[PDB]
Design a protein around this ligand. Structure first.
Ligand SMILES: Nc1ncnc2c1ncn2[C@@H]1O[C@H](COP(=O)(O)OP(=O)(O)O)[C@@H](O)[C@H]1O
Ligand SMILES: Nc1ncnc2c1ncn2[C@@H]1O[C@H](COP(=O)(O)OP(=O)(O)O)[C@@H](O)[C@H]1O
Ligand SMILES: Nc1ncnc2c1ncn2[C@@H]1O[C@H](COP(=O)(O)OP(=O)(O)O)[C@@H](O)[C@H]1O
Ligand SMILES: Nc1ncnc2c1ncn2[C@@H]1O[C@H](COP(=O)(O)OP(=O)(O)O)[C@@H](O)[C@H]1O
Ligand SMILES: [Mg+2]
Ligand SMILES: [Mg+2]
Ligand SMILES: [Mg+2]
Ligand SMILES: [Mg+2]
Lengths: 549, 549
């Protein structure tokens, strides 16, 4: 009410000292302003004092409110004495009290009954205003602040004396908005004590820029921290401010520690040899039950990073493919392919465009059926899968509406995830979450479909080029999510780093001119598959070639 | 000597600034991978460097005589040529000369002409010495390895992916001096990406590749250019080095935040204690000089980013003895009949309004002034740490660090070695502030300089005159802790009541009356205890602050 700043910005050239400051001060509010030197504190006070106007935005004083400012070079009436300066702060009441005392000392030398009537009117007016308590408060203030002798000329006074006189005048003018720039300057400790006890009961609102911590703990109701033009309000006094700031630091530090462990795992992986990489992948293949038991302890996730919630427990039979033949019209895509998918296995599917990878996905899910052979999926298996071409029939639904179904929390198996954070983890941050599904780019639709795939509880995750439109950071996040996932996953991707980092197996197209539909099943990652391919077929035939059919 | 230079480059579309004062110089043959989230500005940088767009401000210059090629989201292809024809157009004149050589070769088969023989020989000289016959072979190798469409297909029927592959092949065979790739792994299978990476590793020209393909960034890039909201951050090294640097700077930031959190929690714990409990740390000092001295005189490492006071010589039982001190100037007395003993490990807070004799008391203790009556005795074990409050220095060009360090990077002060740069940094002179000349220092900067000069003298009795001046709350706590761990005595003049309560074992307070204007009181306890005792002794009105006569 008493003052409002809306998108206020203040700059002198390249230095931005106020940056979209938007604050609303309730009447009588006590704010202490803190921040390093050059943060912008005195500029805020000067704008609120009406000495400065912002370059952009609205800086508005409540109409009918009064303002007073204490600044480094305080303005004093140089043609008036100390007591005169301090008296000038108070308005009409001081002139009427001086007139009352004048008529009082006039009625002893002279008399007039109309002077008595004037005195009765003045007494009523001043009693209705508590004028004599104001003169008493003037004397108490001048005494407690160690003001100079009340009849001294203010031109000869030093900076400290002038500052004390200005502070006294300002305190007695009692503005509705009181602005103090380092008020404890040139005050002794007991004077600071008195000033603090006085301003604690002060009626108006106060903006005090000070490093005096007892002042900030005993006077401030809000702590306004300024830093390079941004303003961070903290509700409470100085101690509450300490508590809240320490908590914000602790939270940010926990997040940074998570990121630290993930960055260190990525560095350790890239620096490791092939022996340790095969050790790690086969070890993953040998520890499904331990990981599942551990992961089934969690029942909620604060989705700061991508995490894949554990699904149902898996049996030994996951996916069994036996002599699979599959094609369309006269062109065969797969001929006589057989493999068994082990528990905790990550399969990388690789091959050129149009050879049958998505067709294999659809045969596994059962939207397509084999022309020969068998694809058996265990009764214990639950699929997480979205069609790559998934399109929404309602174009008006926003990304968050599509993923969350309107709910603040998403159930994924036994795990609860906050929907806003979940959708944010896939690159939809802020207003991107409100973008309608009908106007999504190809990459936005890809990330939407990935989020839709992973919110399905399951132990077999099917991913079709999930690296699309992800940055390197989110790539590492998805890698970590897969490395901590207890179920199985089949992944189509051209990202070789991802394949080497996560896959225990490779299923690769190796079609020939004679047989376009041969595939090879390999235990190991992409680099091991390529080396084995060179060893198996020779370097010239392991090289990529254009496909003909 | 620089294939491309950007100087103060700026790009904006209305008010949205997408490139902001980018200043980069790319040397010929440089391999840069460009990373960053969507909308950071990567494609805009590529278009500027390709000459497709010009910046609003600044210099964006391709080296004269150099060639540039760009792979963009909608690559332009000339529909009037076939796949092979489009890809051949990239090589240009050399391909036309080789086609002429083959034309003459198949012309000499139906009829001969000796003019054809000399033309063939002349062609052979240029094609063998300044060209390579294998250029057509590598053209076919690229079309095969990138899995281009059939070499004889019209490019009108091609899909977006086939068009992309044809464009990439054409671009690779045009061999520009600056090669710009915007998401080059798009529409490539993993084996095609492997071939592209191995091909670009041996590529002669310079490459700017915007890609999230981390094996590319690790095996091709020599620099990692990270873009963020129009800002450009170059990191020297490949992807592994980039990860290393990111993790280490994150670790540094985390240690910084943990330091700040610990200071916040320790300060909160102190303020949340009762009035008695706040005194515990300072009161413990009075019974533990010998333990504290034994600890401080053991050699350990020290965090010199916090305030540190090197321990001085050991103190005897007699520190400072003042007996019936009378002191004044002209006919005005400042101190009358003051007697006190300073205990070892004692910290004395001197309080009183301006001009009552605090600095003169300091000067009597140090001996710059002598008593008018009484005695001030300083123990034979005492070494004073003190600088005059008005210290300025006659050489204005000497910098802050030059003044403090006397030119030494490491200073011996007793048994302690201090790094001068970190030491002076602890007092708020960070970075280029340390090189600021002494003649242009503000009042607060000069106060902090004088404090840093005071604490490096290695005495066991420290005299500080308003040392809180121009210190932020963090450095205030740092100075507090430094004093609480110091094996010796300190006498401190200050108006900061938080400081006094946290550090003082004694208070020396001015208590002048109308009858005796030079009366002082010595009290065992901190500021708050002194005030409570003052009310107990004098009454509420006489304990209140008053004007000095
Ligand atoms: N009238 C002005 N002209 C140029 N620069 C100014 C002006 N007023 C303030 N500044 C600059 O703005 C920054 C913030 O100043 P100020 O608000 O006084 O900082 P503090 O937080 O120390 O009060 C400072 O670096 C100062 O140099
Ligand atoms: N329903 C269908 N009917 C006929 N042919 C199809 C059908 N679906 C896909 N195909 C053909 O199968 C080939 C490969 O399909 P797909 O597996 O989707 O490609 P990719 O191998 O890139 O995943 C394509 O050339 C396409 O023409
Ligand atoms: N012609 C344009 N008009 C307005 N804004 C544009 C234009 N081109 C690019 N931008 C803006 O510039 C920002 C970054 O552009 P760009 O370099 O294309 O993204 P990226 O770095 O992901 O390739 C985007 O937020 C985009 O909105
Ligand atoms: N050398 C001197 N000659 C005359 N008067 C002095 C001298 N030094 C100090 N004074 C006076 O003694 C009083 C106390 O000075 P000082 O102890 O510096 O005050 P404070 O306690 O505020 O530091 C001041 O009013 C000052 O004018
Ligand atoms: Mg200021
Ligand atoms: Mg597909
Ligand atoms: Mg782009
Ligand atoms: Mg002084």
């Amino acid at each position: 009410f008493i003052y409002t700043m809306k998108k206020v910005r203040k700059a002198h050239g390249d230095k931005v000292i106020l940056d979209d400051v938007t604050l609303s001060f309730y009447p009588g509010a006590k704010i202490g302003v803190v921040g390093p030197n050059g943060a912008g504190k005195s500029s805020v006070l000067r704008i609120m004092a009406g000495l400065d106007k912002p370059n952009n935005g609205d800086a508005f004083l409540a109409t009918g409110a009064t303002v007073g400012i204490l600044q480094q070079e305080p303005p004093l009436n140089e043609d008036k004495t100390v007591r005169g300066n301090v008296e000038e702060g108070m308005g009409d009441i001081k002139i009427k009290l001086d007139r009352f005392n004048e008529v009082a000392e006039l009625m002893a030398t002279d008399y007039t009954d109309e002077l008595m009537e004037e005195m009765g009117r003045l007494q009523e007016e001043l009693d209705h205003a508590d004028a004599w308590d104001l003169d008493a408060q003037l004397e108490q203030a001048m005494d407690a602040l160690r003001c100079p002798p009340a009849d001294e000329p203010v031109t000869n006074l030093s900076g400290g004396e002038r500052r004390r006189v200005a502070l006294c005048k300002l305190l007695l003018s009692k503005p509705d908005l009181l602005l103090l720039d380092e008020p404890t300057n040139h005050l002794d400790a007991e004077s600071v004590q008195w000033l603090e006890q006085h301003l604690a009961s002060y009626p108006g609102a106060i903006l005090a820029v000070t490093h005096d911590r007892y002042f900030l703990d005993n006077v401030a109701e809000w702590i306004l921290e300024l830093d390079r033009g941004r303003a961070y309000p903290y509700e409470g006094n100085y101690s509450t401010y300490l508590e809240k700031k320490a908590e914000r630091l602790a939270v940010q530090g926990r997040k940074d520690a998570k990121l630290q462990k993930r960055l260190t795992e990525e560095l350790a992986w890239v620096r490791s040899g092939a022996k340790a990489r095969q050790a790690k992948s086969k070890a993953r293949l040998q520890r499904y039950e331990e990981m599942a038991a551990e992961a089934e302890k969690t029942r909620k996730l604060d989705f700061e990073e991508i995490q894949i919630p554990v699904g149902p427990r898996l049996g030994n039979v996951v996916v069994e493919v036996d002599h699979l033949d599959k094609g369309y019209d006269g062109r065969a895509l797969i001929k006589d392919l057989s493999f068994s998918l082990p528990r905790n296995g990550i399969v990388g599917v690789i091959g050129p465009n149009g050879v049958g990878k998505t067709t294999l996905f659809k045969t596994i899910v059962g939207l397509e059926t084999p022309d020969s052979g068998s694809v058996k999926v265990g009764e214990t298996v639950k699929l997480s899968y979205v069609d790559q071409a998934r399109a929404g029939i309602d174009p008006r639904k926003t990304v968050w509406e599509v993923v969350s179904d309107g709910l603040d929390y998403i159930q994924v198996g036994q795990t609860e995830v906050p929907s806003r954070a979940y959708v944010s983890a896939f690159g939809f941050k802020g207003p991107d979450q409100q973008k309608p599904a009908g106007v999504l780019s190809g990459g936005e639709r890809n990330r939407l479909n990935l989020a839709l795939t992973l919110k399905q509880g399951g132990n077999l995750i099917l991913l079709d080029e999930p690296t699309n439109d992800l940055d390197v950071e989110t790539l590492g996040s998805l890698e970590n999510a897969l490395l901590n996932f207890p179920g199985c996953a089949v992944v189509i991707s051209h990202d070789r780093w991802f394949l080497d980092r996560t896959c225990t197996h490779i299923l690769a197209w190796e079609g020939d001119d004679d047989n376009e539909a041969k595939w090879f099943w390999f235990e190991g990652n992409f680099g091991a598959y390529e080396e084995n391919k060179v060893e198996r077929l020779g370097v010239d035939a392991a090289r990529p070639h254009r496909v003909t059919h």
